[PDB]
Amino acid sequence: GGTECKPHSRPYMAYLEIVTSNGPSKFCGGFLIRRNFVLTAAHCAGRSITVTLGAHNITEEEDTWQKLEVIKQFRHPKYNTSTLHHDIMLLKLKEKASLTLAVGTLPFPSQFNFVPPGRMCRVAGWGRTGVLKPGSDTLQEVKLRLMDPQACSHFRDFDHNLQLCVGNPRKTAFKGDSGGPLLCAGVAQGIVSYGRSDAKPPAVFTRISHYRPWINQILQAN
Numbered sequence: 001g002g003t004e005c006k007p008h009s010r011p012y013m014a015y016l017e018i019v020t021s022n023g024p025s026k027f028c029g030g031f032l033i034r035r036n037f038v039l040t041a042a043h044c045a046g047r048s049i050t051v052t053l054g055a056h057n058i059t060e061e062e063d064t065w066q067k068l069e070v071i072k073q074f075r076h077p078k079y080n081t082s083t084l085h086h087d088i089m090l091l092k093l094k095e096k097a098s099l100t101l102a103v104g105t106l107p108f109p110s111q112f113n114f115v116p117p118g119r120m121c122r123v124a125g126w127g128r129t130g131v132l133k134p135g136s137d138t139l140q141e142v143k144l145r146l147m148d149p150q151a152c153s154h155f156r157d158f159d160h161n162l163q164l165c166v167g168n169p170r171k172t173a174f175k176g177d178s179g180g181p182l183l184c185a186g187v188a189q190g191i192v193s194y195g196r197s198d199a200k201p202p203a204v205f206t207r208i209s210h211y212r213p214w215i216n217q218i219l220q221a222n
């Protein structure tokens with residue numbers, strides 16, 4: 001439970017460098033769903049963003065990298081900084097990524113369903129989430145269980161319809177980066193949103209199914 005990925009085995013993964021209004025840079029994860037669109041968390045928003053596709057060791061620049069500018073951040077309009085509901089955001093890139101072995105998309109399957117508690121999912125990332133110092137600088141993956149929503153009852157506004165409750169406290173800190181995808185059976189079903197300051201599971205993930213209409217609304221107009 002904390003495993004290094006073979007380099008480039010998750011070629012849709014995106015590493016985000018976010019310029020904040022005040023100057024400094026912060027970082028999140030995300031995933032390439034179209035050649036010019038990256039999906040991530042609303043809490044990753046800032047003045048402007050740049051994505052790095054094709055990475056494995058994020059502190060070691062290599063030739064598989066493709067750095068692309070984000071021209072526009074589409075933060076979900078009902079995003080709430082207190083409840084953290086609707087913590088999702090699309091990033092339109094200046095140009096389409098070039099498809100390579102190391103860089104590919106993860107398009108959503110046409111048909112989907114509400115995903116219930118019980119199944120095991122996986123999340124890969126570089127640990128860029130919360131207030132705790134990562135962790136590692138290479139892409140790693142962990143397996144996490146979808147829990148009954150009651151397991152997240154301690155999170156004030158948690159809503160089963162909107163959010164996934166993720167990770168068994170009695171069986172599992174790593175949950176990937178803010179904005180990173182939670183994959184169940186090869187399909188992205190959630191986005192890393194938040195957890196306790198101390199990172200003890202479970203954590204809360206955006207339930208992607210709920211936002212598929214909005215995702216398509218953005219893609220359709222852009």
Ligand SMILES: *[C@@H]1O[C@H](CO)[C@@H](O[C@@H]2O[C@H](CO)[C@@H](O)[C@H](O)[C@H]2NC(C)=O)[C@H](O)[C@H]1NC(C)=O
Pocket residue numbers: 057058059060137138
């Ligand atoms: C990620 O890449 C960086 C940069 O290459 C690695 O950090 C170096 O490790 C080498 C081993 O050859 C040392 O000689 C250097 O002193 C280290 N420099 C830096 C920048 O810290 C890092 O080990 C890589 N992480 C991996 C492979 O997990």
Ligand SMILES: *[C@@H]1O[C@H](CO)[C@@H](O)[C@H](O)[C@H]1NC(C)=O
Pocket residue numbers: 080081082083
């Ligand atoms: C959501 O944030 C809004 C700002 O639009 C705030 O007024 C409200 O208290 C938050 N939601 C609630 C009621 O917890």
